[PDB]
Amino acid sequence: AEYQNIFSQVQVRGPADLGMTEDVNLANRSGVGPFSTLLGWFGNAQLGPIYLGSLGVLSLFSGLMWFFTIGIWFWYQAGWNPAVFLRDLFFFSLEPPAPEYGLSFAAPLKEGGLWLIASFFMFVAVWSWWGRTYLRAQALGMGKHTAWAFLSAIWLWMVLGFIRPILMGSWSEAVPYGIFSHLDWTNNFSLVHGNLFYNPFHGLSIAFLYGSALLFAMHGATILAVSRFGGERELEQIADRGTAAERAALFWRWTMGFNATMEGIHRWAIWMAVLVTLTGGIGILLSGTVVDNWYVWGQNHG
Amino acid sequence: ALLSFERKYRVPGGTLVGGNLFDFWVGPFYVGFFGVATFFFAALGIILIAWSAVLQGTWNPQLISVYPPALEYGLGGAPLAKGGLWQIITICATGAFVSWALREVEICRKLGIGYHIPFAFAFAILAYLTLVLFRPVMMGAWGYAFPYGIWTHLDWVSNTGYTYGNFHYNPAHMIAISFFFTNALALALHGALVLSAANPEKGKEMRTPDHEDTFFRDLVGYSIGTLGIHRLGLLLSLSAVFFSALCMIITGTIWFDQWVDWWQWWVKLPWWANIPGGING
Amino acid sequence: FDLASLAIYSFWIFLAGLIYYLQTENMREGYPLENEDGTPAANQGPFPLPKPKTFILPHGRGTLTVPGPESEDRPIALARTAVSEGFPHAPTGDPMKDGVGPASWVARRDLPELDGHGHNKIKPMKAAAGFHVSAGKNPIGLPVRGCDLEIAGKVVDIWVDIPEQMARFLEVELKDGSTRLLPMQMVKVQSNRVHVNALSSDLFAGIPTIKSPTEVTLLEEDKICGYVAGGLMYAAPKRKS
Ligand code: BCL
Ligand code: BCL
Ligand SMILES: CC[C@H]1c2cc3[nH]c4c(c3C)C(=O)[C@H](C(=O)OC)c4c3nc(cc4[nH]c(cc(n2)[C@@H]1C)c(C(C)=O)c4C)[C@@H](C)[C@@H]3CCC(=O)OC/C=C(\C)CCC[C@H](C)CCC[C@H](C)CCCC(C)C
Ligand SMILES: CC[C@H]1c2cc3[nH]c4c(c3C)C(=O)[C@H](C(=O)OC)c4c3nc(cc4[nH]c(cc(n2)[C@@H]1C)c(C(C)=O)c4C)[C@@H](C)[C@@H]3CCC(=O)OC/C=C(\C)CCC[C@H](C)CCC[C@H](C)CCCC(C)C
Ligand SMILES: COC(C)(C)CCC/C(C)=C/C=C/C(C)=C/C=C/C(C)=C/C=C\C=C(C)\C=C\C=C(/C)CC/C=C(\C)CCC=C(C)C
Ligand SMILES: CCCCCCCCCCCC[N+](C)(C)[O-]
Ligand SMILES: CCCCCCCCCCCC[N+](C)(C)[O-]
Ligand SMILES: CCCCCCCCCCCC[N+](C)(C)[O-]
Ligand SMILES: CCCCCCCCCCCC[N+](C)(C)[O-]
Ligand SMILES: CCCCCCCCCCCC[N+](C)(C)[O-]
Ligand SMILES: CCCCCCCCCCCC[N+](C)(C)[O-]
Ligand SMILES: [Fe+3]
């Protein structure tokens, strides 16, 4: 047959790439890691270096404390034995405080208090990671697109476990930390609010989620189809359109009547994805604060 | 009607069927034999939905709903009023989707590009056919298919899921969701990265792919690269839909009880099955 | 109304401006639309051209402003086949030599892409210190076979993307001792040969050549890639199963 360009046929390796400097503090980059041949069939072989500033070590320290806080609780639920621990891994849960304690931080360790400690640690882990997303871009003089897209995801997370619980006056409304327990919560949330399929925001979220799969399928397939003219080299094709960009546009124009540019498609991309969590977070935020039952709401619209 | 750079590409050839008969455009649209086929199947499907709605007694698109035949018909033909229309429409839709794919193949040939797009599209086509053809046939009735209507089709999703408990517990459905979520993560980042380089801080020079790789290595310690991310997106996308089809093909066929109970295989492994304590003992 | 129907109705408005914005951003190349004779078309659609933006290109290479004046900046050897709009345009010469159809190239700049340090992105591996084949069959030394199952040449080097660490072209030596670049995406490295489906052995000399032996320009890449992709349509008569 013809080659498809899904895996590389030959790997080529040179000296490790220490990266661009620009305004980065090089004192905080690690060494280079090993080269992965396995990874090299699909993308780059080079692991590392990585950047570790104050904000990184903080994120990573808190992130680990969150994880271990949960695991201590799981080991506990498992009467401290490793067979029971593995047997019930998916069934253990760290639940939030009972409605009784509302928004108070006075609930005991065994009945809410641990959930809060863990949630505190998760809160700083994420926000600090967010700042690091911004600062890493600034150090290299790039746009803040990544920090802004990440914020969209933080929106839904913040609504789920922080804002909506505050607005309802209890921590009990937040999500528990468990594999099966957080699925139960989700299914339960829907039932209690009159079926989330009547939440219009939920339906838009779905459309952008599906839409994201559609678009990335279109976009990747397109770039692979024109990789024989150097299509993957997107920044230089922005600066200086080549036949790759031309054929990519034309395929789609001839197919469906309109097309993108090489820069433009990435705007379509970032928005399609970002709107998943943007609409989703609004859908959840309004549930129980303003609308008790989406079926009922859907019958009036008011 | 043409983009400034388009004329050089509008040459004859690349058709699979019909030679030069349908080798032309209408405005921006390539036609081809499969252009004609998709028009024919779409027109016919739309007419038939229209007819369905007169029989239903509503022109309101929020109420129109073409239902499959009742389970009592099994895999037989059914009368038009009671499921036959759904059957003919499904044929037409299948014809229109497959025709759309083959038309993309023609367009690929004329542009001398690869076939990755229609290939990817065939995954969506295959998910559709799982729900309306493969699953129903293995289950022994057209009735197990979803109806064609805006809200009725969500009804179906919901009633179908809840037949098996909370569907979250379908393990293939878990894998599929993972890929869906991950795909959206990856698309956000890809779009963000490229744009953050084309559109750097005000006053600065456009960044380079090296800045892109550096950015990610700084952030998470790895960068898959610019060929790698398009390979990735294609793969996350298609895997999502593959595992979707699979989680449904097995539901009602090999597994027809409550999905939550499936997980008892794990908990009842003899090494730990009777050890007391935990959640499950 | 209530707050939720306020939220949803607002959202739809927002979304409409977003599509507006997105669509006009994707009109910065290729527009205005033209008629087949190149004059500006009457019906441009409902969205207007966006206000121009300017990219500052790195490494002293200037600026780009889009939208801006469009122009192929090359002759196109095609003629109409019908007396009315919408039909194909037949090549008037040899479409592989003339660069039309699937053999098209664009008149990109006749400079090489540079890396973030200002060095040529792509280099023959012989001139790229530290670089080696780390995995897979090394093509260097393999005979190259065309779709007519005849030997067109032998591989004498790999040209590599240094920053992306990736093979991009095989440099192939032909019967007369000259070489050509072939894109990696259009070849098949088998264990005992490289197979090239797009071209027959007799079309390898026709591949456009590069002006310097240790670099390729963006214009040369487009000409080379356009040419070998074009053989899928135009070499076909000579391609065995
Ligand atoms: C029976 C259950 C209900 C239901 C209940 C809910 C509920 C409840 C919710 C959704 C939500 C969503 N549902 Mg619904 N849903 C149902 C039926 C469906 C169906 C379907 C029938 O086919 C589909 C396709 C969907 C699809 C969706 C998505 C569009 C949306 C989630 C977006 C997202 O990306 O979240 C995933 C993304 C996030 C959670 C953001 C996470 C970001 C943070 C910052 C990540 C931190 C990582 C952490 C630090 C760990 C580190 C890891 C290590 C470093 C590796 N639902 C049924 C009807 N659904 C959500 C929504 O938006 O509703 C409007 C939601 O809250
Ligand atoms: C209450 C219901 C149950 C449930 C029951 C079900 C059921 C039942 C199903 C799913 C399916 C899925 N669910 Mg579940 N699901 C639930 C909760 C969730 C949650 C969540 C957040 O809780 C999520 C994220 C999901 C996620 C998903 C996806 C994995 C999958 C749907 C995508 C898909 O198959 O696309 C595949 C895409 C297609 C079929 C689209 C095909 C497009 C065709 C080819 C072309 C269309 C052309 C068209 C006519 C266009 C005309 C255009 C105009 C002319 C322009 N479910 C709850 C617990 N879920 C479905 C699945 O896996 O299906 C295979 C499924 O059947
Ligand atoms: C458009 C919305 C989509 C989206 C977007 C999105 N997510 C993002 C971003 C964006 C734009 C980022 O920039 C950010 C990122 O950095 O990505 C690489 C991120 C991110 N999305 C993440 C996850 C994530 N996103 C999700 C969802 C989505 N994100 C949506 C689908 C989900 C889902 C679907 O639920 C998840 C689970 C994170 C990978 C990353 C944010 C990282 C973060 O906040 O980390 C804080 C915590 C830690 C750093 C430590 C965690 C501890 C772990 C349990 C172990 C980790 C390894 C270990 C610490 C290393 C070894 C230790 C020692 C030996 C050194
Ligand atoms: C493989 C993974 C993802 C994917 C990929 C994908 N889709 C694609 C492609 C690719 C690569 C294309 O090339 C192709 C395209 O042209 O995109 C613009 C396409 C496409 N994906 C589309 C839709 C679509 N894709 C979806 C999903 C996905 N597509 C996946 C998530 C969905 C979902 C998630 O539901 C939808 C709705 C179309 C925009 C387009 C194909 C257009 C097409 O086939 O046109 C010919 C058919 C008609 C013009 C209409 C015929 C009408 C019927 C005869 C009657 C209607 C019957 C129907 C059953 C009614 C249902 C009613 C509903 C209310 C339930
Ligand atoms: C092998 O054994 C070891 C001991 C080594 C470790 C094993 C650990 C292990 C297997 C852990 C398992 C962890 C799992 C499965 C966790 C599951 C997590 C899930 C599913 C989380 C899902 C959603 C969480 C949400 C939405 C939480 C949002 C939290 C927010 C928004 C923060 C809210 C903040 C507060 C309440 C703090 C309030 C106080 C202040 C000052 C802000
Ligand atoms: C999504 C979170 C990404 C986490 C990446 C984890 C990498 C751990 C850093 C180890 C480096 C230690 N060091 C610098 C001494 O080599
Ligand atoms: C999600 C990405 C996977 C994490 C990769 C982390 C790579 C860190 C490499 C740095 C190791 C440095 N060290 C100790 C070998 O010198
Ligand atoms: C940036 C991408 C824009 C594409 C938007 C697609 C709109 C989907 C319409 C879904 C209908 C939602 N509704 C009304 C039922 O809630
Ligand atoms: C879901 C919304 C409707 C489908 C998308 C509209 C397709 C637009 C392509 C036709 C217009 C192209 N044009 C103006 C050259 O004719
Ligand atoms: C409030 C207006 C809603 C308009 C929705 C779009 C109407 C298009 C025709 C819908 C056809 C419905 N059908 C046949 C799938 O059942
Ligand atoms: C429903 C998804 C988004 C629909 C967006 C429709 C945009 C149509 C753009 C048509 C413009 C074509 N034209 C005339 C400029 O060539
Ligand atoms: Fe891209």
Short mmCIF file of N, CA, C and O and ligand atoms in Angstrom, two decimals, chain A residues 209-211 213-215 217-218 221 251-252 255-256, chain B residues 38 41-43 45-46 49 89 92-94 96-97 100 104 116-118 120-124 128 146-151 153 180 237-238 241, ligand 4:
data_model
loop_
_atom_site.label_atom_id
_atom_site.label_comp_id
_atom_site.label_asym_id
_atom_site.label_seq_id
_atom_site.Cartn_x
_atom_site.Cartn_y
_atom_site.Cartn_z
N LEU A 209 -18.92 18.79 23.14
CA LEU A 209 -18.11 17.68 23.51
C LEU A 209 -18.01 16.78 22.33
O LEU A 209 -16.91 16.38 21.94
N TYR A 210 -19.16 16.46 21.78
CA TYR A 210 -19.23 15.70 20.54
C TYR A 210 -18.54 16.50 19.43
O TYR A 210 -17.84 15.96 18.54
N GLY A 211 -18.78 17.81 19.46
CA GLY A 211 -18.25 18.68 18.42
C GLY A 211 -16.75 18.70 18.43
O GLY A 211 -16.13 18.80 17.37
N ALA A 213 -14.88 16.19 19.41
CA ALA A 213 -14.39 14.96 18.81
C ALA A 213 -14.47 15.04 17.30
O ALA A 213 -13.54 14.68 16.60
N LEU A 214 -15.60 15.53 16.79
CA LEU A 214 -15.75 15.78 15.37
C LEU A 214 -14.62 16.65 14.80
O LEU A 214 -14.06 16.32 13.74
N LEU A 215 -14.29 17.74 15.48
CA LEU A 215 -13.38 18.73 14.93
C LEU A 215 -11.93 18.24 14.97
O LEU A 215 -11.19 18.39 13.97
N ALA A 217 -11.13 15.19 15.02
CA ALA A 217 -11.04 14.12 13.99
C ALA A 217 -10.82 14.73 12.61
O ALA A 217 -9.99 14.29 11.85
N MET A 218 -11.57 15.79 12.30
CA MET A 218 -11.41 16.49 11.03
C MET A 218 -10.01 17.09 10.90
O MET A 218 -9.35 16.94 9.86
N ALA A 221 -7.04 14.44 10.84
CA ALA A 221 -7.07 13.70 9.58
C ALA A 221 -6.56 14.63 8.43
O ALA A 221 -5.78 14.21 7.55
N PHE A 251 -10.22 21.03 0.13
CA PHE A 251 -10.92 19.80 0.38
C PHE A 251 -12.28 20.10 0.99
O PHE A 251 -13.31 19.55 0.58
N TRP A 252 -12.27 20.98 1.97
CA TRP A 252 -13.42 21.29 2.81
C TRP A 252 -14.45 22.23 2.15
O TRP A 252 -15.69 22.07 2.31
N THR A 255 -16.17 20.04 -0.21
CA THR A 255 -17.01 19.12 0.52
C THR A 255 -18.30 19.78 1.09
O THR A 255 -19.40 19.32 0.86
N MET A 256 -18.15 20.88 1.80
CA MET A 256 -19.24 21.46 2.55
C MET A 256 -19.48 22.97 2.28
O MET A 256 -20.41 23.56 2.83
N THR B 38 -25.93 11.44 -2.94
CA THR B 38 -26.31 11.92 -1.60
C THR B 38 -27.54 12.83 -1.70
O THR B 38 -28.45 12.71 -0.90
N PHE B 41 -30.68 10.44 -1.98
CA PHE B 41 -31.01 9.82 -0.70
C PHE B 41 -31.49 10.83 0.34
O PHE B 41 -32.40 10.53 1.11
N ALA B 42 -30.90 12.02 0.38
CA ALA B 42 -31.33 13.05 1.34
C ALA B 42 -32.73 13.60 1.00
O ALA B 42 -33.55 13.83 1.88
N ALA B 43 -33.00 13.80 -0.28
CA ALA B 43 -34.26 14.35 -0.69
C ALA B 43 -35.36 13.37 -0.32
O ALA B 43 -36.42 13.73 0.18
N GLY B 45 -35.25 10.80 1.93
CA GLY B 45 -35.40 10.77 3.38
C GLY B 45 -36.22 11.92 3.96
O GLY B 45 -37.06 11.71 4.83
N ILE B 46 -35.99 13.14 3.46
CA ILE B 46 -36.69 14.32 3.96
C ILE B 46 -38.19 14.29 3.61
O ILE B 46 -39.05 14.50 4.47
N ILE B 49 -39.79 11.83 5.95
CA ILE B 49 -39.99 12.36 7.29
C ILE B 49 -41.20 13.30 7.27
O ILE B 49 -42.06 13.26 8.17
N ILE B 89 -36.45 5.22 5.77
CA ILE B 89 -35.58 6.35 6.12
C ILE B 89 -34.18 5.89 6.52
O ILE B 89 -33.20 6.48 6.10
N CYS B 92 -32.21 5.14 3.48
CA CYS B 92 -31.82 6.42 2.89
C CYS B 92 -30.71 7.13 3.61
O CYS B 92 -29.88 7.73 2.97
N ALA B 93 -30.72 7.12 4.93
CA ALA B 93 -29.70 7.81 5.71
C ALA B 93 -28.33 7.15 5.55
O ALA B 93 -27.30 7.81 5.35
N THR B 94 -28.35 5.82 5.67
CA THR B 94 -27.16 5.01 5.40
C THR B 94 -26.60 5.27 4.01
O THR B 94 -25.38 5.38 3.85
N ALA B 96 -27.09 7.97 2.25
CA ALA B 96 -26.56 9.32 2.17
C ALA B 96 -25.23 9.49 2.88
O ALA B 96 -24.47 10.30 2.45
N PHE B 97 -24.96 8.74 3.96
CA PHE B 97 -23.71 8.90 4.71
C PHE B 97 -22.57 8.25 3.96
O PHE B 97 -21.49 8.84 3.84
N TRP B 100 -21.66 10.23 1.06
CA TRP B 100 -20.88 11.41 1.45
C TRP B 100 -19.40 11.05 1.63
O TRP B 100 -18.52 11.78 1.25
N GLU B 104 -16.04 12.24 -0.62
CA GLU B 104 -14.79 12.78 -0.06
C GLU B 104 -13.56 12.09 -0.63
O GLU B 104 -12.51 12.71 -0.76
N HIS B 116 -7.29 10.16 4.96
CA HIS B 116 -7.52 10.07 6.40
C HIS B 116 -8.90 10.59 6.83
O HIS B 116 -9.51 10.06 7.76
N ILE B 117 -9.39 11.63 6.16
CA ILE B 117 -10.68 12.24 6.51
C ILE B 117 -11.89 11.27 6.35
O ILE B 117 -12.59 11.03 7.31
N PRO B 118 -12.14 10.75 5.16
CA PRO B 118 -13.24 9.81 4.97
C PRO B 118 -13.08 8.53 5.77
O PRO B 118 -14.06 7.93 6.19
N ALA B 120 -11.73 8.50 8.80
CA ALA B 120 -12.19 8.91 10.13
C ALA B 120 -13.70 8.99 10.14
O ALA B 120 -14.35 8.57 11.08
N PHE B 121 -14.27 9.55 9.08
CA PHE B 121 -15.70 9.68 9.01
C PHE B 121 -16.37 8.30 9.13
O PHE B 121 -17.42 8.19 9.74
N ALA B 122 -15.76 7.27 8.57
CA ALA B 122 -16.36 5.95 8.60
C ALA B 122 -16.53 5.46 10.02
O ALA B 122 -17.37 4.63 10.28
N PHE B 123 -15.75 5.97 10.96
CA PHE B 123 -15.98 5.61 12.37
C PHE B 123 -17.35 6.14 12.87
O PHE B 123 -18.09 5.42 13.55
N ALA B 124 -17.69 7.37 12.54
CA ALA B 124 -19.02 7.86 12.91
C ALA B 124 -20.13 7.04 12.27
O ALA B 124 -21.12 6.64 12.91
N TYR B 128 -23.27 5.04 14.25
CA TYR B 128 -24.67 5.07 13.76
C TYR B 128 -25.19 3.66 13.47
O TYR B 128 -26.22 3.27 14.01
N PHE B 146 -33.00 3.42 18.08
CA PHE B 146 -33.48 4.71 18.54
C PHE B 146 -34.38 5.37 17.53
O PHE B 146 -34.22 5.16 16.35
N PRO B 147 -35.37 6.12 18.00
CA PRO B 147 -36.30 6.80 17.12
C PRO B 147 -35.70 8.11 16.62
O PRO B 147 -34.80 8.70 17.28
N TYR B 148 -36.19 8.58 15.47
CA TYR B 148 -35.69 9.84 14.92
C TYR B 148 -36.57 11.01 15.36
O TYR B 148 -37.63 11.24 14.79
N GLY B 149 -36.13 11.68 16.41
CA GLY B 149 -36.74 12.90 16.89
C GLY B 149 -35.82 13.56 17.90
O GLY B 149 -35.04 12.86 18.56
N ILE B 150 -35.89 14.89 18.00
CA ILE B 150 -35.00 15.68 18.86
C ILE B 150 -35.04 15.22 20.30
O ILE B 150 -34.02 15.00 20.92
N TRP B 151 -36.23 15.11 20.85
CA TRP B 151 -36.38 14.82 22.27
C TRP B 151 -36.63 13.35 22.51
O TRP B 151 -36.14 12.79 23.49
N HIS B 153 -35.31 10.90 20.93
CA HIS B 153 -34.03 10.17 20.88
C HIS B 153 -33.30 10.26 22.24
O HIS B 153 -32.69 9.29 22.65
N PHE B 180 -13.25 10.66 25.21
CA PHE B 180 -13.99 11.89 24.95
C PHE B 180 -13.45 13.07 25.76
O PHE B 180 -13.15 14.11 25.22
N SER B 237 -10.00 10.86 19.22
CA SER B 237 -11.30 10.93 18.58
C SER B 237 -11.85 9.63 18.15
O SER B 237 -12.99 9.31 18.48
N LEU B 238 -11.09 8.89 17.37
CA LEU B 238 -11.61 7.68 16.79
C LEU B 238 -11.78 6.59 17.85
O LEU B 238 -12.66 5.73 17.73
N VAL B 241 -15.08 6.88 19.80
CA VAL B 241 -16.27 6.43 19.09
C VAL B 241 -16.21 4.92 18.95
O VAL B 241 -17.22 4.24 19.03
C1 LIG D 4 -15.30 9.80 14.21
C2 LIG D 4 -15.55 10.67 15.44
C3 LIG D 4 -16.40 11.92 15.26
C4 LIG D 4 -16.87 12.42 13.88
C5 LIG D 4 -16.07 12.58 12.77
C6 LIG D 4 -16.44 13.05 11.49
N1 LIG D 4 -17.74 13.46 11.21
C7 LIG D 4 -17.79 13.93 9.93
C8 LIG D 4 -16.51 13.78 9.36
C9 LIG D 4 -15.66 13.24 10.31
C10 LIG D 4 -14.20 12.93 10.14
C11 LIG D 4 -16.58 14.27 8.00
O1 LIG D 4 -15.73 14.31 7.12
C12 LIG D 4 -18.04 14.70 7.76
C13 LIG D 4 -18.15 16.16 7.42
O2 LIG D 4 -18.52 16.59 6.36
O3 LIG D 4 -17.94 16.98 8.41
C14 LIG D 4 -18.14 18.36 8.05
C15 LIG D 4 -18.77 14.39 9.06
C16 LIG D 4 -20.06 14.74 9.41
N2 LIG D 4 -20.51 14.57 10.69
C17 LIG D 4 -21.75 15.10 10.82
C18 LIG D 4 -22.54 15.06 11.99
C19 LIG D 4 -22.25 14.47 13.23
N3 LIG D 4 -21.07 13.86 13.57
C20 LIG D 4 -21.06 13.39 14.84
C21 LIG D 4 -20.04 12.69 15.46
C22 LIG D 4 -18.73 12.49 15.06
N4 LIG D 4 -18.22 12.75 13.86
C23 LIG D 4 -17.76 11.86 16.03
C24 LIG D 4 -17.88 12.37 17.48
C25 LIG D 4 -22.35 13.72 15.35
C26 LIG D 4 -22.79 13.37 16.72
C27 LIG D 4 -21.77 13.27 17.80
O4 LIG D 4 -23.98 13.18 16.98
C28 LIG D 4 -23.08 14.37 14.40
C29 LIG D 4 -24.50 14.91 14.51
C30 LIG D 4 -22.17 15.81 9.59
C31 LIG D 4 -22.06 17.30 9.85
C32 LIG D 4 -21.07 15.47 8.58
C33 LIG D 4 -21.64 14.49 7.55
C34 LIG D 4 -22.76 15.06 6.66
C35 LIG D 4 -23.47 14.05 5.85
O5 LIG D 4 -23.37 12.82 5.92
O6 LIG D 4 -24.27 14.60 4.94
C36 LIG D 4 -25.05 13.75 4.09
C37 LIG D 4 -26.40 13.59 4.77
C38 LIG D 4 -27.29 14.58 4.72
C39 LIG D 4 -27.01 15.90 4.02
C40 LIG D 4 -28.64 14.49 5.42
C41 LIG D 4 -29.43 13.21 5.16
C42 LIG D 4 -30.71 13.24 5.98
C43 LIG D 4 -31.23 11.84 6.28
C44 LIG D 4 -31.45 11.01 5.01
C45 LIG D 4 -32.54 11.97 7.07
C46 LIG D 4 -32.26 12.26 8.53
C47 LIG D 4 -32.04 10.93 9.25
C48 LIG D 4 -31.43 11.07 10.63
C49 LIG D 4 -31.26 9.64 11.15
C50 LIG D 4 -32.30 11.97 11.50
C51 LIG D 4 -31.89 11.94 12.95
C52 LIG D 4 -32.65 12.97 13.76
C53 LIG D 4 -31.95 13.31 15.08
C54 LIG D 4 -32.77 14.37 15.78
C55 LIG D 4 -31.76 12.13 16.01
#
